[PDB]
Amino acid sequence: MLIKVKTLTGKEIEIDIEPTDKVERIKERVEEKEGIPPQQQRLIYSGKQMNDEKTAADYKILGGSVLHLVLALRGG
């Protein structure tokens, strides 16, 4: 199952994942290709921010689904 995840720059990468895979694994797959430390990754899918423990299944991620990396800035 291939899914797309867009980074904080709008760059979209393709990753291969299985319904049974854990969310932190998705992050690892992202880091493999982009170098983005999974510690600073915040993933959104259909308005929910993905817990590292839950699985691709729990969020019902389909084939060509798109995940987005997000952030909250604290400067005023």
Partner: protein, 789 residues
Amino acid sequence: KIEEGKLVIWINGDKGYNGLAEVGKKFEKDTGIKVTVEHPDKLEEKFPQVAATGDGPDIIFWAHDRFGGYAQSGLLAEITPDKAFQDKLYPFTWDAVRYNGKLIAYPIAVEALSLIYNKDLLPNPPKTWEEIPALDKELKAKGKSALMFNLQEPYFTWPLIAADGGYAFKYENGKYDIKDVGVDNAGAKAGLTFLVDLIKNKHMNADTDYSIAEAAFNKGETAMTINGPWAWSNIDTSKVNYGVTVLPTFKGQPSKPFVGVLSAGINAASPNKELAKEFLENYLLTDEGLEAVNKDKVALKSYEEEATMENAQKGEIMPNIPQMSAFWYAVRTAVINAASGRQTVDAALAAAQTNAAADWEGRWNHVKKFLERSGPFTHPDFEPSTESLQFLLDTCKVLVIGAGGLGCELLKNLALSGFRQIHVIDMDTIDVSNLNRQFLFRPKDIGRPKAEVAAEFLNDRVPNCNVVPHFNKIQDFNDTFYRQFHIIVCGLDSIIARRWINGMLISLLNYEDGVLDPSSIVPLIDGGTEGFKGNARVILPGMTACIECTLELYPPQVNFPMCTIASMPRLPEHCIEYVRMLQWPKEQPFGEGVPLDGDDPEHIQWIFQKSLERASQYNIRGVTYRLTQGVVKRIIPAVASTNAVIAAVCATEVFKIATSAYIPLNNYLVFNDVDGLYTYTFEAERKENCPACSQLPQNIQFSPSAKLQEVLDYLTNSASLQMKSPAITATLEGKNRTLYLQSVTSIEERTRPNLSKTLKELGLVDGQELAVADVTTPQTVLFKLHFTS
């Protein structure tokens, strides 16, 4: 703050400051409460400054035309006396001392222009203007002019113009209308044409200014000139006889000079407000007070009875509002030009009409587009209208938290969208580093409160704006302070502050009968920035993701482990931290006790130097002064553009929410522009067990006659709760009240009595929130008391 119990009164030098202080001496002598009166220079200018930051005088005396400004900035407190005491003073004086349908000051003295004529030449004062010219032919036959007065000022000339119907600003039942000016009507055009004819028929000359006309009447060369109680002095030094005769009516209608009211205002911060009702309504508003004050150098009927009044009677009261100043400039040149044959009275007044108004033609053209028309994408509750803009312009209270960066940008943005009723809170002072993006500050402002300067820059740049500053931490205002606002926007730079305001607004929510009451909701718009990344979000408390719901979206917190800093440094930052949190505290280089100040150049240098050495021992390179400041201050890189993108979005949304023009951003937007420019928008899901907005008050039903013990039994027995030993508190009369507590003997002893008093006795009321905590509750929970009787 202002000292409680005493009354520091402010008044002007040229106002009898000795016969009044004595009316303050009879005060402490009679009550023990002392009076200190001062006559500071520029106090009418010094008051707004201090009345804003809280402190200042309890009372102050000045012409009503200033209080319009104070009132608007919220510097005055609404005075409130009975109709029986209001009859002691005249029925009209109260308007001059009013704002938004509220009385803001107590009338002291009054003033107005009248006609002064040389008694001998003509012991008949003219009853109308029509005849005034007829006399120049006689006097000129002698070498004199019948009349002569200052024309260079629209104050002296205004009485005649207004005669047939000239009014500064339309006064509706409770407030002045700055959009409808009475200088364009036939009532004024008629009055001006006349003044001009006498300019052409040579009965007069448009150059007759105050000093010219003065030096002439002082010799007894004219029948009359117009003046008042401030000019009677030099006519007595020249033994020239005269009188304070009536102002010649005109075209039937009577004359209408301008009206000034000397009055005392009660500061909105001065806690000694109830001490002002006395010293005034009693120790002044009498014959005993006013005369003692008057013998030094009136609105009170009794003392007044013991010509100036008639004019002020039939003449319109001089406006107090801010737009009034644009009136003077507008008509002043609208007369100069006229009488000078530079343009026709018509076109002359045409100008004055518009130039005095607040909204020039087309000003809100870009806004009106979205409020007056319609379309396929408007918010389902949207309805085309001309009132929305008036709502924006007249009553929509918006608060901006943070001045500088997003703050400065937001003020600009809201001001150019129709908002006028705006507040700004900021706890900071200006720093030279703010100047690369915080465009409302200049080098000369360094050191001043951001909010203060931000407010003054905007109120000037964008006319008719009423920004009210607050040099404070949002954290030092209460729930009642934030409920007054319709909407709140943030440009803060710390998570703690956001967590805080977020909590304050959720605390205001009222869930009546199980469903959240929409009017207890104060929408929060928040934006954050760091370098070229930024975010914005719209929060509707109790309805959508709150700050705490998305709290995890913040990147990992900068943290240096102790073993690393103390024993295993490897990055230059590591060395700088060691010096900052270990070496300094242990050496106190600038004195024992003196803390580290990141803004102190000499502190940073010391830190930089010591850091170079720590680095040295570990062959760690890269320690620079710039990096030392970075680590110490924990600096966030910043530029104007990113703050502009985010403040833009935040502002567009405040607009949509205040007008329902469109549905607001479905809560979240991220922005980044290091690589092309990207944005992403999404609906953050509301956390199910959010510690801040997911807990609803519990409903309990008791009789007002019930005993607090029953409420305790319920909490402890009730199968669904059954707590060990609860603690119950409540807010009554604005203060916290411990109803019952049992983990501190001294308190438990003292509150047990409460256990056998009825909820009607304890002061509780229907809907009231009882806060109860216990080992059973992970966090204090709220029960809403509903009376069954």
